[PDB]
Design an enzyme around this catalytic site. Structure first.
Site, mmCIF file in Angstrom:
data_model
loop_
_atom_site.group_PDB
_atom_site.id
_atom_site.type_symbol
_atom_site.label_atom_id
_atom_site.label_comp_id
_atom_site.label_asym_id
_atom_site.label_seq_id
_atom_site.Cartn_x
_atom_site.Cartn_y
_atom_site.Cartn_z
ATOM 1 N N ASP B 13 132.998 101.866 45.815
ATOM 2 C CA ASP B 13 132.375 101.963 44.519
ATOM 3 C C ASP B 13 132.879 100.782 43.689
ATOM 4 O O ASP B 13 133.527 99.853 44.208
ATOM 5 C CB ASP B 13 132.586 103.356 43.869
ATOM 6 N N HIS B 102 148.038 111.170 65.731
ATOM 7 C CA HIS B 102 147.732 112.595 65.873
ATOM 8 C C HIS B 102 146.303 112.945 65.737
ATOM 9 O O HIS B 102 145.848 113.885 66.380
ATOM 10 C CB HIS B 102 148.459 113.435 64.830
#
Lengths: 145, 146
Positions: B13, B102
Site C-alpha cells: 500500500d 517450521h
C-alpha cells in the site's frame, strides 16, 4: 480502557498448554467467561491446525480467541484462513494495540516458547482493552472480509 | 546459504512503497527475478487488501511473495486467507528463520513504519536462504493447506 469483550475461547497444541492454562486463569480473575478448547494437557504431541476450528467458529463481535503454538506463526496462518477472523501474533503490547486499533483483530496468537507468561499476560490485557479506531481503517477491515 | 527461490512478487500500500522499491532493488542485485505488483508510487492512499491478490496468485514452490503495509499486520491477515499461502510478519531474522524452518513460509510481510530498511534487508535475506526443515513439521504444513 474497558474490556471490549468478556468471552474468550482459547486453544493450543502441546507446546502452549501451560501458557494457555495460565492465561485462562488470568482471564477468569478478570471476570471473563472462558472456554478451554484443548488440546488435553495429557497430550505430548499434536498438530496445531487441528485446534483452530473450535475457537474460530465461536469468534464474533462479542467473543475473542487466543491460539498458542510454539512460535505463534502456525496458529496465525491457520486462523486467518477464515474470513471472519483477524488474527495477530503479538509478542509486545505495541503490536496488540495496533492490531486492535487498525485491524479490529479478534484472535490473539502467542508463541509459548518465546514469550514469558508475565509478558503474555500484559499483551493479552492490552488486546482485550484496546478499542478499534474505525475511520479510515473501517474500509480495509471490511475488505478483509 | 543457497537462495531457495529466484522469483519474488512484491506489493504494498502507500505506506510500503519506499521499502518495497528498496527491497526490489536488493533482490535484483542478488540475481532474482523481481515482479512489482503495485501500488503505483504516485498513489498516496490505497487499501492494502486490494494489493494482495496479484502476489498470492503467483506464489508457489518456485515463487515467494513480499507484502508491505504500515504494520504488516493487515497484509499477513489478508495473505493467509488463501490455502496455498503461508505468510509471516517478521521484524527479525529469528522469526524469518523460524517461519521458513517450521512453516515453510512462502510470503514475508513487513511493517514499513516500524522496521528500518537495513534490518528489513537482513530479514528478507534470511527468509530467502532458510530451508524448510520438513520432518515433524511436514504434517502440520500439509494441514495448513487442507
Amino acid at each position: 480502557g474497558s474490556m471490549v469483550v468478556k468471552r474468550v475461547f482459547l486453544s493450543s497444541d502441546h507446546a502452549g498448554v501451560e501458557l494457555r492454562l495460565f492465561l485462562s486463569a488470568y482471564l477468569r480473575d478478570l471476570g471473563c467467561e472462558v472456554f478451554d478448547c484443548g488440546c488435553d494437557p495429557k497430550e505430548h504431541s499434536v498438530d496445531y491446525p487441528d485446534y483452530v476450528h473450535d475457537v474460530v467458529r465461536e469468534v464474533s463481535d462479542t467473543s475473542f480467541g487466543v491460539l498458542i503454538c510454539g512460535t505463534g506463526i502456525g496458529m496465525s496462518i491457520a486462523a486467518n484462513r477464515h474470513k471472519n477472523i483477524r488474527a495477530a501474533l503479538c509478542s509486545s503490547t505495541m503490536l496488540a494495540k495496533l492490531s486492535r486499533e487498525h485491524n479490529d483483530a479478534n484472535v490473539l496468537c502467542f508463541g509459548s516458547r518465546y514469550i514469558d507468561p508475565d509478558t503474555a499476560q500484559s499483551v493479552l490485557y492490552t488486546f482485550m482493552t484496546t478499542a478499534f479506531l474505525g475511520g479510515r481503517h473501517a474500509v480495509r477491515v471490511q475488505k478483509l472480509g
